[PDB]
Design an enzyme around this catalytic site. Structure first.
Site, short mmCIF file in Angstrom:
data_model
loop_
_atom_site.label_atom_id
_atom_site.label_comp_id
_atom_site.label_asym_id
_atom_site.label_seq_id
_atom_site.Cartn_x
_atom_site.Cartn_y
_atom_site.Cartn_z
N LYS A 176 -5.63 -7.05 49.64
CA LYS A 176 -5.02 -8.23 50.27
C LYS A 176 -3.88 -7.83 51.22
N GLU A 183 -3.04 -17.59 51.33
CA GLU A 183 -3.13 -16.23 51.88
C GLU A 183 -4.43 -15.97 52.60
N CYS A 200 -5.86 -6.14 40.62
CA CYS A 200 -4.89 -5.83 41.68
C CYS A 200 -5.33 -4.76 42.70
N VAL A 260 6.41 -13.36 45.86
CA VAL A 260 6.26 -13.39 47.31
C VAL A 260 4.84 -13.80 47.61
N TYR A 270 -1.41 -20.13 46.04
CA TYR A 270 -1.10 -19.01 46.92
C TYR A 270 -2.29 -18.19 47.42
N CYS A 322 -3.98 -7.53 44.90
CA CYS A 322 -2.82 -7.11 45.66
C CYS A 322 -3.03 -6.11 46.78
N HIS A 366 24.89 -7.64 59.76
CA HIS A 366 24.60 -8.30 61.02
C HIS A 366 23.98 -7.33 62.05
N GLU A 397 21.46 -11.99 56.08
CA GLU A 397 22.88 -12.35 56.06
C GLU A 397 23.14 -13.86 55.91
N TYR A 416 -5.39 6.81 39.68
CA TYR A 416 -5.19 6.19 38.37
C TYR A 416 -5.93 6.91 37.27
C1 LIG Z 1 26.66 -0.66 71.06
C2 LIG Z 1 27.25 -1.37 69.88
C3 LIG Z 1 26.41 -1.87 68.91
C4 LIG Z 1 26.94 -2.48 67.78
N1 LIG Z 1 26.06 -2.96 66.88
C5 LIG Z 1 26.58 -3.52 65.75
C6 LIG Z 1 25.68 -4.12 64.79
O1 LIG Z 1 24.46 -4.18 64.95
N2 LIG Z 1 26.26 -4.68 63.68
C7 LIG Z 1 27.63 -4.69 63.50
O2 LIG Z 1 28.07 -5.21 62.50
N3 LIG Z 1 28.46 -4.13 64.38
C8 LIG Z 1 27.98 -3.59 65.51
N4 LIG Z 1 28.83 -3.11 66.43
C9 LIG Z 1 30.30 -3.15 66.16
C10 LIG Z 1 30.90 -4.53 66.47
O3 LIG Z 1 30.56 -4.90 67.80
C11 LIG Z 1 32.43 -4.50 66.33
O4 LIG Z 1 32.77 -4.04 65.05
C12 LIG Z 1 33.06 -5.86 66.52
O5 LIG Z 1 32.75 -6.33 67.81
C13 LIG Z 1 34.58 -5.79 66.36
O6 LIG Z 1 35.22 -7.16 66.58
P1 LIG Z 1 36.66 -7.33 66.96
O7 LIG Z 1 36.99 -8.75 66.74
O8 LIG Z 1 37.44 -6.31 66.25
O9 LIG Z 1 36.68 -7.01 68.44
P2 LIG Z 1 35.76 -7.39 69.75
O10 LIG Z 1 34.56 -8.04 69.33
O11 LIG Z 1 35.69 -6.23 70.61
O12 LIG Z 1 36.59 -8.42 70.42
C14 LIG Z 1 37.89 -8.13 71.07
C15 LIG Z 1 38.11 -9.15 72.18
O13 LIG Z 1 39.50 -9.16 72.59
C16 LIG Z 1 39.54 -9.26 73.98
N5 LIG Z 1 40.74 -8.69 74.44
C17 LIG Z 1 41.16 -7.38 74.39
N6 LIG Z 1 42.40 -7.25 74.78
C18 LIG Z 1 42.88 -8.47 75.11
C19 LIG Z 1 44.13 -8.92 75.56
N7 LIG Z 1 45.20 -8.12 75.64
N8 LIG Z 1 44.24 -10.21 75.92
C20 LIG Z 1 43.17 -10.99 75.81
N9 LIG Z 1 41.95 -10.70 75.35
C21 LIG Z 1 41.84 -9.39 74.99
C22 LIG Z 1 38.31 -8.50 74.44
O14 LIG Z 1 37.87 -8.95 75.71
C23 LIG Z 1 37.30 -8.81 73.42
O15 LIG Z 1 36.56 -9.96 73.83
C24 LIG Z 1 28.35 -2.58 67.61
C25 LIG Z 1 29.21 -2.13 68.63
C26 LIG Z 1 28.68 -1.52 69.75
C27 LIG Z 1 29.59 -1.00 70.80
C1 LIG Z 2 -6.78 -12.29 45.52
C2 LIG Z 2 -5.67 -11.85 44.61
C3 LIG Z 2 -4.48 -11.41 45.15
C4 LIG Z 2 -3.44 -11.06 44.33
N1 LIG Z 2 -2.31 -10.62 44.92
C5 LIG Z 2 -1.26 -10.31 44.12
C6 LIG Z 2 -0.06 -9.75 44.70
O1 LIG Z 2 0.06 -9.52 45.91
N2 LIG Z 2 0.97 -9.46 43.84
C7 LIG Z 2 0.85 -9.65 42.48
O2 LIG Z 2 1.78 -9.34 41.77
N3 LIG Z 2 -0.26 -10.16 41.93
C8 LIG Z 2 -1.32 -10.45 42.70
N4 LIG Z 2 -2.45 -10.89 42.13
C9 LIG Z 2 -2.50 -11.08 40.65
C10 LIG Z 2 -2.77 -9.75 39.92
O3 LIG Z 2 -3.94 -9.14 40.45
C11 LIG Z 2 -2.96 -9.99 38.41
O4 LIG Z 2 -1.85 -10.69 37.90
C12 LIG Z 2 -3.11 -8.71 37.63
O5 LIG Z 2 -4.24 -8.01 38.11
C13 LIG Z 2 -3.30 -9.00 36.14
O6 LIG Z 2 -3.48 -7.70 35.34
P1 LIG Z 2 -4.13 -7.65 34.00
O7 LIG Z 2 -3.82 -6.34 33.42
O8 LIG Z 2 -3.75 -8.87 33.26
O9 LIG Z 2 -5.61 -7.75 34.32
P2 LIG Z 2 -6.63 -7.05 35.40
O10 LIG Z 2 -5.89 -6.33 36.39
O11 LIG Z 2 -7.60 -8.04 35.83
O12 LIG Z 2 -7.34 -6.04 34.57
C14 LIG Z 2 -8.27 -6.39 33.50
C15 LIG Z 2 -9.27 -5.24 33.34
O13 LIG Z 2 -9.97 -5.34 32.07
C16 LIG Z 2 -11.31 -5.03 32.29
N5 LIG Z 2 -12.09 -5.68 31.31
C17 LIG Z 2 -12.29 -7.02 31.10
N6 LIG Z 2 -12.96 -7.25 30.00
C18 LIG Z 2 -13.23 -6.06 29.40
C19 LIG Z 2 -13.88 -5.70 28.21
N7 LIG Z 2 -14.29 -6.61 27.32
N8 LIG Z 2 -14.08 -4.39 27.97
C20 LIG Z 2 -13.65 -3.51 28.86
N9 LIG Z 2 -12.98 -3.71 30.00
C21 LIG Z 2 -12.77 -5.04 30.24
C22 LIG Z 2 -11.59 -5.56 33.69
O14 LIG Z 2 -12.66 -4.86 34.29
C23 LIG Z 2 -10.34 -5.28 34.42
O15 LIG Z 2 -10.43 -4.00 35.04
C24 LIG Z 2 -3.56 -11.16 42.91
C25 LIG Z 2 -4.79 -11.55 42.35
C26 LIG Z 2 -5.83 -11.90 43.18
C27 LIG Z 2 -7.12 -12.37 42.58
#
Ligand SMILES: Cc1cc2nc3c(=O)[nH]c(=O)nc-3n(C[C@H](O)[C@H](O)[C@H](O)COP(=O)(O)OP(=O)(O)OC[C@H]3O[C@@H](n4cnc5c(N)ncnc54)[C@H](O)[C@@H]3O)c2cc1C
Ligand SMILES: Cc1cc2nc3c(=O)[nH]c(=O)nc-3n(C[C@H](O)[C@H](O)[C@H](O)COP(=O)(O)OP(=O)(O)OC[C@H]3O[C@@H](n4cnc5c(N)ncnc54)[C@H](O)[C@@H]3O)c2cc1C
Ligand SMILES: O=C(O)CCC1c2ccc(O)cc2Oc2cc(O)ccc21
Lengths: 461, 461
Positions: free
Chosen positions: B49, B184, B41, B353, B180, B46, B450, B455, B97
């Site tokens: 890579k 990769e 690894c 993954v 895999y 891992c 959101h 989500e 290690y």
């Molecule tokens: C800058 C910003 C970033 C945000 N980013 C996020 C985010 O990333 N994630 C998240 O979950 N939340 C985010 N929010 C919060 C989110 O936008 C609000 O929680 C959500 O819009 C609330 O929904 P609502 O239905 O209560 O009201 P609104 O979405 O505001 O809808 C109310 C609607 O009623 C209408 N209305 C009002 N009065 C009347 C009326 N008397 N007659 C007719 N129509 C009317 C309005 O025109 C409006 O369209 C963000 C808010 C802002 C300001």
């Molecule tokens: C290209 C590649 C990418 C990978 N990517 C991922 C990843 O992203 N995520 C993931 O979870 N897994 C990944 N894996 C798998 C992961 O590396 C292995 O599952 C893991 O290393 C297994 O551990 P181990 O303890 O079984 O053996 P190893 O880690 O291979 O360790 C065995 C050790 O024993 C030693 N040894 C062997 N024989 C003897 C002996 N007789 N005397 C003394 N020492 C000895 C060796 O030198 C070695 O150091 C990847 C593997 C490869 C090849």
């Protein structure tokens, strides 16, 4: 008065989702929308933001080309190329959503709805009246801006809505606010080349997130070139011969306050809060309860204080996310039209991703919330902090921090918080596990996928 | 004869993990390694890579710069810059290690171990004998190559080991194999600029994976420029004045076979299989059972047919992954030194993954395996195929395919298969959910994040 089975006010995330599921169940539904279907998320939220985040990500990784053996790309990013393709994509989505409603036979009533003084709940849109035994208010919200009375010149700054109208990358920008929208905007503007400052009232951003995250996120911002102005707030803004001049007061506890002028600012972006869209609904005509900020009050089933009237989404002011409005909207449709009286959304364990650099993923309780709910003696956290394998060969570095919050003897996983490369796509599955009630042993008994950053969460000790 | 509590043969993934956990439990352990610690690894698996995959990923995304508003980067990739930083990173890991073993007081015996004819299991390393009541064989495996008798000139091609020794990017390469490792290598060589052909005996790669994946993966390879030569195999290889000349026979069912010569090949890479490292252990001296390929036979507890002798990892020939060797190695340490007699690894639901482009993530049963185990009437699959939002603005496109395999009335999620951007970091959490016994309703009741590709898995219908 045209009658329907379900009348939805607002064609955004929650409204469309609820109307569509209701229609599938047999309800003759109509959606009222005064602007563009898709609402905030599609038009000035999630979608245009994600495209811009994908753009910023290219900009950051470009710093690493030479380390990986690639030639350096010369220079200038062109904002309008991506801005236009982004707008086009939003246009494509609006057309798709319209088509989705038509194919489901949902009627779209265009215009602004407002309740009437009629006894049985009735709305009026452009002179016409509409009614239904079930009316959903899903009007969402809008960006909050300071009053000119409290901050002279506040109207010279833009909000996130304005951010999506920008046709050129601002040279100098000041973002005011410390929530996720502020952090996201600052991160995109900075990655793309704007000289960016993020003004916050305290010392850290995202103060409602686990402290490991607010701390790490503030540092990553600084490491990436964002100037974080702590304990600062705008006193006033004025238009100069070349840009805006921002006067701010910085009051670090234990020091005297100091006034500073930030000159030649091209863009001042207020990201201080969201306000619910309820002022023009004439809610008062039916006596629908709201809190002092204008949010509609609802119970666990999304019922308002008035029978036959419900509210979901941002307008209710809790868990302001698109998938929450959607899930609540659908659960409500099943309750009303499929008669599943227990159908309601569980507001616990709702997962969130903040598209910062690197992205943040969080679900469940922060360490402090768990400590208050279970007691210090019953909370155990596991965390790790490492530099992802991707940076093993780069001069630039980002960190990956993960924290698992466990409760009680069995170590029920009550919270997962992390920031790092890949965290945006990594969270969904763990959110499924947390929702099921996984314990630390469940995570520990799942074979890891190597080499990934995600495997760190199943091998914490 | 120096005695220990635990003698581990092989300092790779499974051997190190088992020795370290045993030491934590109080065992005086020694590890025998004839080569480099970290095994396959770290040295030729891992780790090197993944670094090369991260390099190929930069190459692919570079095709999208101009679509995102960035200037085009001129040209030439330099293989040796990254090759050298990669080698350095592997050197850093080997040192880490070694330090980990020393800090745990595990003795490292350098050299090649082989069992002796002594009654009680005893090994000899460089003339010295060592024994222990518990001996673990974790010798792993090695790349398989064709015999010159069956394919004249086979020795002119390299294996994955040789891939990591390449100091220059080959101009023309032919990868032979369909597993895999083959996929990769072909994907990295092609992304980096080598004119690549992948020779397979059938019509699709990864034939043991769900059919949606083998099909989609073969198409993505072709779409990315890899020439997939179906129903073909090497008849012979010869060294010409400028490269190798590969003679192959293509026998498409229903057509006459045709012989073809592939000229000017710089690199022929055999990725046809792995063979266990057991030939030089003198297993026959103790009567340790092996199958005809040389794999050591073990029961569910990793016991061989001889008491006090165990085997884990690649040498056993099943689930050839690093985390599997590690988990089995640790579970064995707990069984022997903590006396947890039920401690053993569950070989079901092991996630994998494949670092292709885009990456593949899979856990559980393929649709066919579920059909055979539960019966056609009891298997329901849900799938989706979409173009990730990232490509909404690009000319280049990749697809994201997801399939969920459910069994019985409750729709227990027995298999998840997907390919797409972000799938490499997305799988771990869903693997935790599947291991817990999640049903489709558990996924469906988890609020979505959101906007992400992840989500889609919680909103399948
Ligand atoms: C800058 C910003 C970033 C945000 N980013 C996020 C985010 O990333 N994630 C998240 O979950 N939340 C985010 N929010 C919060 C989110 O936008 C609000 O929680 C959500 O819009 C609330 O929904 P609502 O239905 O209560 O009201 P609104 O979405 O505001 O809808 C109310 C609607 O009623 C209408 N209305 C009002 N009065 C009347 C009326 N008397 N007659 C007719 N129509 C009317 C309005 O025109 C409006 O369209 C963000 C808010 C802002 C300001
Ligand atoms: C290209 C590649 C990418 C990978 N990517 C991922 C990843 O992203 N995520 C993931 O979870 N897994 C990944 N894996 C798998 C992961 O590396 C292995 O599952 C893991 O290393 C297994 O551990 P181990 O303890 O079984 O053996 P190893 O880690 O291979 O360790 C065995 C050790 O024993 C030693 N040894 C062997 N024989 C003897 C002996 N007789 N005397 C003394 N020492 C000895 C060796 O030198 C070695 O150091 C990847 C593997 C490869 C090849
Ligand atoms: O700019 C480049 O060449 C790399 C882009 C890129 C990237 C590169 C390497 C990697 O390991 C991950 C990775 O992820 C993304 C994600 C994006 O949304 C955009 C670009 C990327």
């Amino acid at each position: 008065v045209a009658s329907y089975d379900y009348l939805v006010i607002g064609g955004g995330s929650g409204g469309l989702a609820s109307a569509r599921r209701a229609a599938e169940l047999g309800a003759r539904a109509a959606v009222v929308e005064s602007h563009k279907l898709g609402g905030t998320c599609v038009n000035v939220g999630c979608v245009p933001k994600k495209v811009m985040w994908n753009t910023a990500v290219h900009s950051e990784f470009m710093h690493d080309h030479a380390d990986y053996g690639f030639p350096s790309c010369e220079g200038k990013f062109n904002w309008r190329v991506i801005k236009e393709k982004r707008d086009a994509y939003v246009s494509r989505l609006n057309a798709i959503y319209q088509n989705n409603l038509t194919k489901s036979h949902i009627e779209i009533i265009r215009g602004h709805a407002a309740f009437t003084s009629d006894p049985k709940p009735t709305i009026e849109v452009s002179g016409k009246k509409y009614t239904a035994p079930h009316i959903l208010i899903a009007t969402g919200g809008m960006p909050s801006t300071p009053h000119e009375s409290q901050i002279p010149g506040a109207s010279l700054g833009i909000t996130s809505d304005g951010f999506f109208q920008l046709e050129e990358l601002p040279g100098r920008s000041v973002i005011v606010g410390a929530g996720y929208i502020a952090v996201e905007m600052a991160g995109i503007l900075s990655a793309l080349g704007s000289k960016t400052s993020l003004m916050i009232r305290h010392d850290k951003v995202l103060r409602s997130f686990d402290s490991m995250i607010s701390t790490n996120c503030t540092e990553e911002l600084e490491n990436a070139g964002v100037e974080v102005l702590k304990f600062s707030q705008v006193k006033e803004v004025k238009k100069t011969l070349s840009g805006l001049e921002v006067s701010m007061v910085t009051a670090v506890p234990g020091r005297l306050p100091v006034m500073t002028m930030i000159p030649d600012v091209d863009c001042l972006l207020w990201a201080i809060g969201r306000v619910p869209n309820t002022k023009d609904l004439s809610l008062n005509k039916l006596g629908i309860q709201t809190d002092d900020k204008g949010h509609i009050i609802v119970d666990e089933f999304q019922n308002t204080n008035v029978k036959g009237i419900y509210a979901v989404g941002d307008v209710c002011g809790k868990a302001l996310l698109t998938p929450v409005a959607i899930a609540a909207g659908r659960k409500l449709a099943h309750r009303l039209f499929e008669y599943k009286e227990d159908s309601k959304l569980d507001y616990n364990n709702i997962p969130t991703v903040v598209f910062s650099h690197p992205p943040i993923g969080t679900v469940g309780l922060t360490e402090d919330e768990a400590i208050h709910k279970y007691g210090i003696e019953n909370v155990k956290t596991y965390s790790t902090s490492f530099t992802p394998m991707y940076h093993a060969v780069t001069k630039r570095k980002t960190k990956c921090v993960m924290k698992m919050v466990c409760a009680n003897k069995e170590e029920k996983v009550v919270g997962i918080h992390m920031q790092g490369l890949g965290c945006d796509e990594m969270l969904q599955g763990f959110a499924v596990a947390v929702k099921m009630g996984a314990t630390k042993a469940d995570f520990d008994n799942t074979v890891a996928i190597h080499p990934t950053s995600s495997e760190e969460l199943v091998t914490l000790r």
